[PDB]
Design a protein around this ligand. Structure first.
Ligand SMILES: Cc1ccc(N)cc1C(=O)N[C@H](C)c1cccc2ccccc12
Ligand SMILES: Cc1ccc(N)cc1C(=O)N[C@H](C)c1cccc2ccccc12
Ligand SMILES: [Zn+2]
Ligand SMILES: [Zn+2]
Ligand SMILES: [Zn+2]
Ligand SMILES: [Zn+2]
Lengths: 313, 304
């Protein structure tokens, strides 16, 4: 009979040596099973699953009960996906680089580091108590729990490359952005001018341009009627803004921005490095730290600090 | 959910799959990133990935009786085409992507050892890997090792599956085991076993004598008697170890926990080089955690 040697844990520290019978579901061996942040309760054991550690979560366990108030989520697989990915993120190294907490390269965490580095510089707060606890500990150097939560809130698996803008979007859904306000005036000369209002994550993020000043002057976006119109920023009541765009050559001048992220490589297979401005421009590539006065490379996301804004027009 | 599948590994075909039927029922034999995902049902985290589809003529070029080899090779090829292979220090390396920390160290080590592959497909890709086109060679390694793109692998383990297809017929290792109370017997290894060794990083310790428990227990001493190979590979767990220039050929270090770390390649020529994929740094001395050390050799005879 087909067999395999897999370890299963309920504490992420103590392993249980187990033998499973292939052709039979993982859910039939020990119930709800999770591996590297993936709900693997209905998958049959594959050959490439040997020697790996699986997490088991009883449905009767009280940890599933008090899951909402602590994590602010309704997904039943959240606890298992978070605990299984936590077993792998405990193996990562979190070196302090340039005063900020980073991550050593492992399992394509090129994007997870860039997200963690950006959050340390923006004045942001999370409504979920688990995030605020892990976010604090992530700043002290112990960021294993924070990275596992990010993979759970983003429905990702350890080893899979993720997008920074997409991962920040799922994450900021649990952040305190109630007082965030963005007022945009769209001017279609065949439909007059109308004013839209975004609140929350939509008031902070934008996709299309990297320049905050370009948003203030005017960008092109399709109107509802079906033709190109121009829109510019009118009011901004947030602690920061995140500008996004595809990778392209872009000059980064000191003092004009807060931090940024670069992406070198093809679509869905590349490498993120973080750019931050302090006394000089820093380029944090996980554990490596290089300084330069001016950086010109393919950047995708640029952060700007803000308290309040009103147009001059 | 939305799934991409290709039949030529170049042109994608947007396709729709159901949540209740195995991938083998949708397009037949299906493979993803070097993994046979034919009898597997579609999972939630499988959106946006490209799957390869298959139905022969594998043994003559690939030296395998495995049916799933071509699919695993073609699916891993779809992902290895996105990687960059920059020539670093005259050798072809790979920039970090999907935990290929170990694949680069293997490719860098093969360029310095005088080895040749019996399989025609390997020799085709190995030559192109030195010319700069190493996308096909990386896909074959994951197939010969039954690995998946993105998952971290061991260099010593993947080299074992790889060297099984190399010309090691004339490889010979003769070891004399000396148990002080049971006499002495001499074993002879040939092939991959004649090249690799686990336990110490120092070749001089193998020639002088290393400790290994005898079958009846206790501890016995073993030393090298005859070695008829083009190179030897010494391996050991990560530990601090001094690397002197000229005493070795190349080595590989490993920083991090078990099964979650980072491989960097070390090569010795005019000065010590530390190749971290695309990064090139030079230094005089090195003190760090090394796991695999190479030594070049053609023949040896003990003085005792
Ligand atoms: C790394 C990654 C993982 C998952 C997904 N879904 C996307 C990406 C990704 O490529 N992101 C970068 C920023 C990107 C975004 C938009 C257009 C791009 C075109 C070319 C190259 C990069 C591009
Ligand atoms: C990266 C990796 C992936 C898959 C597998 N099966 C193993 C490894 C791995 O850890 N290899 C390194 C060199 C290693 C080898 C031997 C003992 C080690 C003890 C502690 C730390 C590292 C050790
Ligand atoms: Zn209009
Ligand atoms: Zn990739
Ligand atoms: Zn004995
Ligand atoms: Zn890892």
């Amino acid at each position: 009979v087909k067999t395999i040697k897999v370890f299963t844990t309920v504490d992420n520290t103590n392993l249980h040596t187990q033998l499973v019978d292939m052709s039979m579901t993982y859910g039939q061996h020990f119930g709800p099973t999770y591996l590297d942040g993936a709900d693997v309760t209905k998958v049959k054991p594959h050959v490439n699953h040997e020697g790996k550690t699986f997490f088991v979560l009883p449905s009767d366990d009280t940890l599933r009960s008090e899951a909402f108030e602590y994590y602010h989520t309704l997904d039943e697989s959240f606890l298992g996906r978070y605990m299984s990915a936590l077993n792998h993120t405990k193996k990562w190294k979190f070196p302090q680089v340039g005063g900020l907490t980073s991550i050593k390269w492992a399992d394509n965490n090129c994007y997870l580091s860039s997200v963690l580095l950006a959050l340390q510089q923006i004045e942001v707060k999370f409504n979920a108590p688990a995030l605020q606890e892990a976010y604090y500990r992530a700043r002290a150097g112990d960021a294993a729990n924070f990275c596992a939560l990010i993979l759970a809130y983003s429905n990702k698996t350890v080893g899979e490359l993720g997008d920074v803008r997409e991962t920040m979007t799922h994450l900021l859904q649990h952040a305190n952005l109630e007082s965030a306000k963005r007022v945009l005036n769209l001017v279609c000369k065949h439909c007059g001018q109308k004013t839209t209002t975004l609140m929350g994550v939509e008031a902070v993020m934008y996709m299309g341009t990297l320049s905050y000043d370009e948003l203030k002057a005017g960008v092109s976006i399709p109107c509802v009627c079906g033709r190109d119109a121009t829109q510019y920023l009118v009011q901004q009541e947030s602690s920061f803004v995140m500008m996004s765009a595809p990778p392209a050559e872009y000059k980064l001048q000191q003092g004009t921005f807060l931090c940024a992220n670069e992406y070198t490589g093809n679509y869905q297979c590349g490498h993120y490095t973080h750019i931050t401005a302090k006394e000089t421009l820093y380029r944090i590539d996980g554990a490596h730290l290089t300084k330069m006065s001016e950086y010109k490379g393919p950047v995708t996301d640029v952060f700007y600090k803000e308290t309040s804004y009103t147009t001059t027009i």
